[PDB]
Amino acid sequence: MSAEGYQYRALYDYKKEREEDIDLHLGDILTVNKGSLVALGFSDGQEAKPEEIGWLNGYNETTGERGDFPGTYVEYI
Amino acid sequence: MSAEGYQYRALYDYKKEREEDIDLHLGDILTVNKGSLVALGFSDGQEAKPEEIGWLNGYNETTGERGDFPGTYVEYI
Amino acid sequence: MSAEGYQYRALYDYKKEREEDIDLHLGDILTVNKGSLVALGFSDGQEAKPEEIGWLNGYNETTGERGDFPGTYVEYI
Amino acid sequence: MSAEGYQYRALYDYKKEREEDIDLHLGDILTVNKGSLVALGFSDGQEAKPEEIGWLNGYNETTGERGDFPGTYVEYI
Amino acid sequence: MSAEGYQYRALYDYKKEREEDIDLHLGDILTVNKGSLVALGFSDGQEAKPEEIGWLNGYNETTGERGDFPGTYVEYI
Amino acid sequence: MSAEGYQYRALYDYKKEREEDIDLHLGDILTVNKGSLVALGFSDGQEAKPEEIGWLNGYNETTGERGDFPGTYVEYI
Amino acid sequence: MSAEGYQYRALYDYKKEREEDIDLHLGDILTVNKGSLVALGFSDGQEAKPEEIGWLNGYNETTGERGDFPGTYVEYI
């Protein structure tokens, strides 16, 4: 198993578990705004994205790309 | 197994589990705005995307690309 | 198994599981706006996309591309 | 198995599971606007797309492309 | 006299001159290409625009806009 | 006289001159390419714009905009 | 006379001169390429713009903007 490169997160997972009778309770979320609000530039104001998912066993991206996003791929063979 | 490159998330998952009788309760989400709001530039105001999914076992993208997005692919063979 | 490149998420999934009698309760989502709102530029106001899906076992894109999006593919063989 | 390239999500899924007697309850979504609203530019106001799907086992795109979208394919053989 | 703003070239010219018996000789321009040439992407090859003007006393634009050019004007009064 | 702002070139010219019997000789320009040339991406090859002007007393733009050029003006009054 | 701001070149010119019988000789320019050339990315190859002007007394821009150029103006009054 090999990895190289600049900024990478390479988890090599090997887990074997028996997990029984778990009760887990999170709680709720409240965001309140009262009053006059002015937001300027790369500001936000009150950015508030509610994402409620149950049973993540795969892959999830919630990707907010806000701005100016260039990308150049260059390969010589 | 090999990986290289600039900013990558290469998880190599191997998990074998038995998971029984789990009760899990999240809770709710409330966002409130009272008052006069002015948003300018790459600001947001109150951006609030509700995504409720149950049983993610595959792949999910919620991708908000807001702005100016160039992309150039260049390959020499 | 090989991977290279600039910003990639290469998950190599291998999972073998037995999962029984799970009760899971999420909760609800409320977004409220009271008052005069002015949104300018790449702002949003209150962007609020409700996506309720059950049993994601495959692929999902909710892709909001808002703005100016060029793309150039160039390949020499 | 090989992958290269600029910004890619290459999941190589291999999952073998037995999944029984799951009860899962999401909850509902409410978005409220009271008051005078002015939206300008690449703003939104209250963009609110309700997508309720059950049993995603394949592929799904909800793609909102709002703006100016050029694309050039160039290939030399 | 007032100026503000992001990237501006505000010349405030005040010149009072007496200019006599000037002899000025520029010379010529030659561009030669020999050989096989392949140009790809936002490349050029040999872009070679000959502009010969005499006695510029006003305004001149030779503007080569090659590509993808969006522009949005937004004004609230 | 006032100036502010981000990246500006504000020349405030006041010049009063007597300029007599000047002989000035520039010389010529030759660009030669021999051989096989391949240009890829935002490359150029041999970009070679010949601009010969005599007696610039006003304004001149030779503007090569090659690529992807968005612009957003946003003003609240 | 006032100036402020981030990166500015504010020349406040006041010049009063008598300039007589000047002989000035520049010389010529030759660029030669022999051989196989490959240029990739934001490379150039041999970019070679010949600009021969005589008697610049005003303003001149030779502006090569090659790439991805966003600009956002935002002003609240």
Numbering used by the authors:
A (entry chain G), B (entry chain E), C (entry chain C), D (entry chain A), E (entry chain B), F (entry chain D), ...: 1 to 77
In the authors' words:
Here we present the high-resolution cryo-EM structure of amyloid fibrils of the Src-homology 3 domain of phosphatidyl-inositol-3-kinase (PI3K-SH3). The structure of natively folded PI3K-SH3, a domain consisting of 86 amino acids from bovine PI3K, has been well-characterised by X-ray crystallography and NMR spectroscopy. SH3 domains are known to play a significant role in several signalling pathways where they mediate protein-protein interactions by recognising PxxP sequence motifs. Used initially as a model system for protein folding studies, PI3K-SH3 was among the first proteins discovered to form amyloid fibrils in the test tube, while not being associated to any known human disease.
A three-dimensional density map for the thick PI3K-SH3 fibril could be reconstructed to an overall resolution of 3.4 Å. The clear density of the fibril allowed us to build an atomic model for residues 1–77 out of a total of 86 amino acids. The missing nine residues are located at the C-terminus, which shows blurred density likely due to substantial flexibility. The thick PI3K-SH3 fibril is a left-handed helical structure consisting of two intertwined protofilaments, and is thus called DF (double filament) fibril. Protofilament subunits (PI3K-SH3 monomers) are stacked in a parallel, in-register cross-β structure. The helical symmetry is therefore described by a twist of 179.4 ° and rise of 2.35 Å, which corresponds to an approximate 21-screw symmetry. Each protofilament subunit, or PI3K-SH3 monomer, consists of seven parallel in-register β-strands (β1, aa1-5; β2, aa7-19; β3, aa22-26; β4, aa28-34; β5, aa46-56; β6, aa59-68; β7, aa72-77) that are interrupted by either sharp kinks, glycine or proline residues—or a combination of those. By encompassing 13 residues of each monomer, 26 in total, the inter-filament interface of the PI3K-SH3 DF fibril is very large. The protofilaments mainly interact through two identical symmetry-related hydrophobic patches at the periphery of their interface, between the bottom part of the bent β-arch motif and the respective C-terminal part of the opposing protofilament. A single subunit in the PI3K-SH3 DF fibril is not planar but winds itself along the protofilament axis, which leads to interlocking within a protofilament.
